[PDB]
Structure 1
Amino acid sequence: PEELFTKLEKIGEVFKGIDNRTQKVVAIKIIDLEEIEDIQQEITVLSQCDSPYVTKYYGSYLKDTKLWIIMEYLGGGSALDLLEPGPLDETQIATILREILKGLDYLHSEKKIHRDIKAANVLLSEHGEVKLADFFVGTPFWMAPEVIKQSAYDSKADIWSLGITAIELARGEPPHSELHPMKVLFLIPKNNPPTLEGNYSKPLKEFVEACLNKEPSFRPTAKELLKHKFILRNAKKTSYLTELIDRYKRWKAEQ
């Protein structure tokens, strides 16, 4: 059946697997089909995406009642995983942001909206390549005020989410992280937008402020932000991110 792949360790259950034809590692999500419409939608979008900044989809298979979804394997962890040992520096922040922006620029140029940009959905390869993962929708802390209000929105909603993600990358968590999500649901539309507080460079605070404009048309586009002062002064080779990957592995081993 699906002996085109060898299931390795569990990493909806996700497994590391190996493509028997090439010996390349894949991620295998196995869903017991026994609502299916949401799974259905996710698969169609992934197969419609084709970018090095977006997790590759390799195909779906049915075995008995189980759907096998073959995905790009990325063994560096999520950006959220990499915050666990301690703070990032601004080079690491800018580098990660820059790659997310390339992914957003790709998606926004293809008339797509991610709708769930957050550090947990930014995945790294073992070599430090950064890609976007995981397809009123979103995760409340990162949701744009127009999304929460169930108002009309477009790709600018992702830009707001990018700003909240920039705060998460700098501070380790989004604004309001200690509050019940239902309270956050009224706070976001009501309150002044968050700002990055603490000892960060002016360009970084300015990058965040630009994303977090309550008026979506005043937020820059992903193309524009790729040329932001903070990105240009601070972003370096993605291969330098291996240091963060190593930091996490060491941290995770010590418990």
Structure 2
Amino acid sequence: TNLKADPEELFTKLEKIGKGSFGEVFKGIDNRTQKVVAIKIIDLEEAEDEIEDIQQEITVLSQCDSPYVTKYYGSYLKDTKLWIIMEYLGGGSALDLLEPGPLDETQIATILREILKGLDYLHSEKKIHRDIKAANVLLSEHGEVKLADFGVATPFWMAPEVIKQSYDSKADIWSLGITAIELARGEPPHSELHPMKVLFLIPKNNPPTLEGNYSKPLKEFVEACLNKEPSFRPTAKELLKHKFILRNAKKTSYLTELIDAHHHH
């Protein structure tokens, strides 16, 4: 964290993207390069109880160097406000891109494959994302797919063993299975229910299945991820060779059509 430089001289703050975790996020410009950045501004007096979680996400992101994890550029302290600088991904989140209408299975498989490449990276680095969901998957304007918003070390994407506070990288594989349902259907299982009910339903019930006129390989991909027994879930490495992925995923550049569809909607 840079406690001497003035982030307001280094960056031009533009429109708010939204309210992410801990603080508000803005599109911005690096005044030296003119590249577009994402800027999170956290009021450290308002958000004092969460400061250690902020620090640990900074540490984790600063240790990542992968095409599949959103790039971290640094942090700055100005008066009471912490500025966190990340690369700007102009395609939006996968959740955003569901808005115009359903994805097809080529788009689903392509997005899951890229998520799996990021999970393979993280798990090989002995890291766990802990919040895989469509809202935390960001696309560049070119269709590149990257992970953002790591979870801290809402229940709908949580593995049962995380809820029972009993976990390792296989929790991410469960969340990936929920995310696969989300990309196919628009919403995770139990999305109509109160979160406190979902908290006991996930451990209690059989795992969700993908319901609808979807290919059997896609239903099998979901079922493989959504086993109650973590040791029965496959690794990310193994899932990159799943027949659903191999038979349906195509070049990421094709996802620009999905980004364009969202702009015309």
Mean Cα displacement is larger for which, 16-25 or 55-64?
A: 16-25
Deviation at 1:119, TM superposition (A): 0.2
Number of positions where the alignment pairs a residue of Structure 1 with one of Structure 2:
249
Asked if structure 1 preserves the Cα contact closer than 8 Å seen for 2:53 and 2:152, the reply is: no
In structure 1, distance between residues paired with 2:100 and 2:32: 38
Deviation at 1:136, TM superposition (A): 10
Cα distance change of structure 1 residues 133 and 51 upon mapping to structure 2, 3 Å threshold: same
Deviation at 1:64, TM superposition (A): 1.1
Deviation at 1:63, TM superposition (A): 0.9
In structure 1, distance between residues paired with 2:44 and 2:206: 44
Residue in 1 that maps onto 2:37: 26
In structure 1, distance between residues paired with 2:27 and 2:218: 37
Asked if structure 2 preserves the Cα contact closer than 8 Å seen for 1:116 and 1:138, the reply is: no
Gaps of 5+ in 2: 1-6, 18-22
In structure 2, distance between residues paired with 1:32 and 1:214: 40
Tell me whether 1:9 sits opposite 2:24 in the alignment: no
Q: CA-to-partner distance for each residue in 1:56-82, whole Å, 9 max, x for gaps?
A: 110000111111100010111100001
Deviation at 1:159, TM superposition (A): 0.2
TM-score by length of 1: 0.94
Asked if structure 2 preserves the Cα contact closer than 8 Å seen for 1:31 and 1:67, the reply is: yes
Deviation at 1:41, TM superposition (A): 1.4
Deviation at 1:138, TM superposition (A): 8.9
Cα distance change of structure 1 residues 39 and 136 upon mapping to structure 2, 3 Å threshold: closer
Q: Residue 8 of structure 2: SS of its match in structure 1?
A: coil
TM-score by length of 2: 0.91
Deviation at 1:137, TM superposition (A): 5.9
Matched residues, percent identical?
98
In structure 1, distance between residues paired with 2:27 and 2:190: 35
Cα distance change of structure 1 residues 72 and 137 upon mapping to structure 2, 3 Å threshold: closer
User: After TM superposition, where is structure 1 displaced by more than 6 Å over at least 4 residues in a row?
Assistant: none
In structure 1, distance between residues paired with 2:212 and 2:171: 25
Alignment equivalent of 1:223, drawn from 232, 237, 244: 237
Deviation at 1:10, TM superposition (A): 1.6
Asked if structure 1 preserves the Cα contact closer than 8 Å seen for 2:117 and 2:236, the reply is: yes
Q: Residue 205 of structure 1: SS of its match in structure 2?
A: helix
Asked if structure 2 preserves the Cα contact closer than 8 Å seen for 1:108 and 1:155, the reply is: yes
> Aligned Cα RMSD in Å?
1.5
